[PDB]
Design a binder for this molecule. Structure first.
Ligand SMILES: C[C@@H](O)CNc1cc(N2CC3(CCC3)[C@@](F)(C(=O)O)C2)ncn1
Length: 167
């Protein structure tokens, strides 16, 4: 038993809700919140901009030190950093950004990072400003992640569409 409330169950291990991942995180304080990161951990907009703002920019400060030490992530890769006031940990995961021409097949590799964590609160990778089809992203999530994933979908309209088209 865990504290996630109001999710629709899609599969044995994947759950979905219409929620602001930021407000979902502040209430649940999950062990892991997933950020829709880029390789530079520049958290300017989309989910990343919203998460970072909710930490009062502490996420960005920590991220800049991480990059200064380690260099950029790989597309399809991830790193674990602090969850600040939102979660114990933040798993920064880089899905491909279609608006940069990145290969969509890397979306599966991105979701594989979730399997290193028993339970996660997460957005749909490569959705929103990353330019991928959220329905494809949901399919890859279901077909790749084996651990327990609670997906927060900000837009009520897309949420309804994802549920209604889910196979
Ligand atoms: C209130 C909002 O500002 C932040 N709260 C969100 C956003 C979100 N999206 C997902 C997405 C990141 C990968 C696709 C995104 F960038 C996009 O849909 O463009 C933003 N998902 C959950 N909560």
């Amino acid at each position: 038993v865990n504290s996630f409330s109001g999710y629709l169950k899609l599969t044995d291990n994947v759950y979905i809700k219409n929620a602001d991942i930021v407000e979902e995180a502040k209430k649940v304080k999950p062990t892991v919140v997933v950020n829709a990161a880029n390789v530079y951990l520049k958290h300017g907009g989309g989910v990343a901009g919203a998460l970072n703002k909710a930490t009062n920019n502490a996420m960005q400060v920590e991220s800049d030190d991480y990059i200064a030490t380690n260099g950029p992530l790989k597309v399809g890769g991830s790193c674990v950093l602090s969850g600040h006031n939102l979660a114990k940990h933040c798993l920064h995961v880089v899905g491909p950004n279609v608006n940069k021409g990145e290969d969509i097949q890397l979306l599966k590799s991105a979701y594989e990072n979730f399997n290193q964590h028993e339970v996660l609160l997460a957005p749909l990778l490569s959705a929103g400003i990353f330019g991928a089809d959220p329905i494809h992203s949901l399919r890859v999530c279901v077909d790749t992640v084996r651990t327990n994933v609670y997906l927060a979908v900000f837009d009520k309209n897309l949420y309804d569409k994802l549920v209604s088209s889910f196979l």
